[PDB]
C-alpha cells in the first residue's frame, strides 16, 4: 500500500528544529522541499506553538491528519493545491512567532488558526465562486451563492477532523471543542476575499480612530479574519523570484478557468482570466496590490510592528510589477 509507506516514513522521522527548517522566516520558500519535508515542517509548527503537548495530540494521529489534509488538495490545480495551504500555514506560524502575534491570542485561537490555515482551500476545484454560481453547481445551490467554496472547504475540514485515526481534536473538553470549531469556521470563511472587502473598512476605521482593542470579542474575531487574509495572500509579499514563480501558477489557474468559461458559458473571460490578454498581467498585479494588499499589510504592521517585513516585501513587489507595467 502506497499511503501507508508515506505515513510510516513521517511518523518514524525525528522532526528537525524550527531553526533548521527556516519556518520562522517571512521570506520562506517551499520550492526546494519534498512533500515529506513539508509534513515535517507542519509537525514542527504544531509542536512549537505548544499545541501537541497542550491538547495531547498523539503523534501518529497528527501525522495521519496532516497527510489526509495534503491528500485532499487536488495536486494538478496549479495554485490552489497543498503547497498554497502549506505556505499559508507557514505564514501564520511566522506571524505568530517572528511577527509576535502569538501572545495576543488564546491557545484555542492559535489551534484553530493553524488548522484553518492548512484546511482553508481543501478540495479546491481551481475555479472561482462566480464560476460555480454561473455553472449552477449544486454547491452554489446548497450554500445560497454565499462563500460557496469556503463552505465546501469547511465541510471538508470537518470531514477529515472526524475521520478515524485523524481526530487531532479528540482530546479537547466539550467546551474547548465547541469553541475551536466555531473559530475554525469563521477563519475559513474569512478567506473568501469578498468577505475581506466587506469587513475591512470597519477594521481600518477602528485603527485609524484609535478604537482598536483586541479585548473586545467582536474586534478579536475581526482581527482573526484579517490575519487569515494576510496569510492567504502572503505569496504577494515574498522575494521577487518566489512571488514571480507563484504568480505564474495563479495565472495558469485563472487562465484555465477562462478557457472553461469560453467553452461552458460562451463568454469572453474578464482580463484576469483571459490568456489572450495576458499583456494585462503587470497592470492587474499592481492594481491588486494597491486595492487589496497594501492597506492590509499596513494595518497588520500597526497591530504588530514585527509584521513589517510582509509590508516591505509587498511594497517591493509593487515596484517590480510597476516597472514591467510602465
Ligand atoms: C481575485 N484575485 C484578483 C487578483 O488580481 N489576484 C492577483 C492577480 C493579478 C493579475 C493576474 C493574476 C492574479 O492572474 C492573472 O493575472 C494575484 N497575484 C498573486 C500573486 C501571488 C499569488 C496569488 C496572486 C493573486 C490572486 C488574486 C485574486 O485571487
Ligand atoms: Mg480560498
Ligand atoms: Zn487560499
Swiss-Prot record:
Q: What does this protein do?
A: Plays a role in signal transduction by regulating the intracellular concentration of cyclic nucleotides. This phosphodiesterase catalyzes the specific hydrolysis of cGMP to 5'-GMP. Specifically regulates nitric-oxide-generated cGMP.
Question: Residues that bind Mg(2+), according to the entry?
Answer: 121
**Lineage per the UniProt record:** Eukaryota, Metazoa, Chordata, Craniata, Vertebrata
Q: Where is the active site?
A: 80
Top-rank taxon of the source lineage equals: Eukaryota
Coiled-coil spans in chain:
none
Q: Impact of altering residue 235 to N?
A: Changes substrate selectivity from cGMP-specific to dual cAMP and cGMP binding and hydrolysis
Where is 3',5'-cyclic GMP annotated to bind? 285
Let me see what the UniProt entry remarks about domains: Composed of a C-terminal catalytic domain containing two putative divalent metal sites and an N-terminal regulatory domain which contains two homologous allosteric cGMP-binding regions, A and B.
Family statement drawn from the similarity comment of this UniProt entry: Belongs to the cyclic nucleotide phosphodiesterase family.
Q: In which tissues is it expressed?
A: Expressed in aortic smooth muscle cells, heart, placenta, skeletal muscle and pancreas and, to a much lesser extent, in brain, liver and lung.
Supply the name of the protein: cGMP-specific 3',5'-cyclic phosphodiesterase
Per UniProt, where does Zn(2+) bind? 84, 120-121, 232
Which species is listed as the source? Homo sapiens
Which part of the complete protein is shown?
A: 534 to 858 of 875
Amino acid at each position: 500500500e502506497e499511503e501507508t509507506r508515506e505515513l510510516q516514513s513521517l511518523a518514524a522521522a525525528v522532526v528537525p528544529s524550527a531553526q533548521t527548517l527556516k519556518i520562522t522566516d517571512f521570506s520562506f520558500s517551499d520550492f526546494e522541499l519534498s512533500d515529506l519535508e513539508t509534513a515535517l515542517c507542519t509537525i514542527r509548527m504544531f509542536t512549537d506553538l505548544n499545541l501537541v503537548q497542550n491538547f495531547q495530540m498523539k503523534h501518529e494521529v497528527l501525522c495521519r491528519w496532516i497527510l489526509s489534509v495534503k491528500k485532499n488538495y487536488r495536486k494538478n490545480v496549479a495554485y490552489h493545491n497543498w503547497r498554497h495551504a502549506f505556505n499559508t500555514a507557514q505564514c501564520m506560524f511566522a506571524a505568530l512567532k517572528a511577527g509576535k502575534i502569538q501572545n495576543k491570542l488564546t491557545d484555542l485561537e492559535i489551534l484553530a488558526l493553524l488548522i484553518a490555515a492548512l484546511s482553508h482551500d481543501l478540495d479546491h476545484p481551481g475555479v472561482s465562486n462566480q464560476f460555480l454560481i454561473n455553472t449552477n453547481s449544486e454547491l452554489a445551490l446548497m450554500y445560497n451563492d454565499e462563500s460557496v467554496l469556503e463552505h465546501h472547504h469547511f465541510d471538508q475540514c470537518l470531514m477529515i477532523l472526524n475521520s478515524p485515526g485523524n481526530q487531532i481534536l479528540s482530546g479537547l473538553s466539550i467546551e474547548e471543542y465547541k469553541t475551536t470549531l466555531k473559530i475554525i469556521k469563521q477563519a475559513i470563511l474569512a478567506t473568501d476575499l469578498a468577505l475581506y472587502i466587506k469587513r475591512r473598512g470597519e477594521f481600518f476605521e477602528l485603527i485609524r480612530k484609535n478604537q482598536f482593542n483586541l479585548e473586545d470579542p467582536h474586534q478579536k474575531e475581526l482581527f482573526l479574519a484579517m490575519l487569515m487574509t494576510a496569510c492567504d495572500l502572503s505569496a504577494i509579499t515574498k522575494p521577487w523570484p518566489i512571488q514571480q514563480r507563484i504568480a505564474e501558477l495563479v495565472a495558469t489557474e485563472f487562465f484555465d478557468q477562462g478557457d472553461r468559461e469560453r467553452k461552458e458559458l460562451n463568454i469572453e473571460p474578464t482580463d484576469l482570466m483571459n490568456r489572450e490578454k495576458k499583456n494585462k498581467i503587470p497592470s492587474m498585479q499592481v492594481g491588486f496590490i494597491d486595492a487589496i494588499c497594501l492597506q492590509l499589510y499596513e494595518a497588520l504592521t500597526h497591530v504588530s510592528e514585527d509584521c513589517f517585513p510582509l509590508l516591505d516585501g509587498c511594497r517591493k513587489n509593487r515596484q517590480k510589477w510597476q516597472a514591467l507595467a510602465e
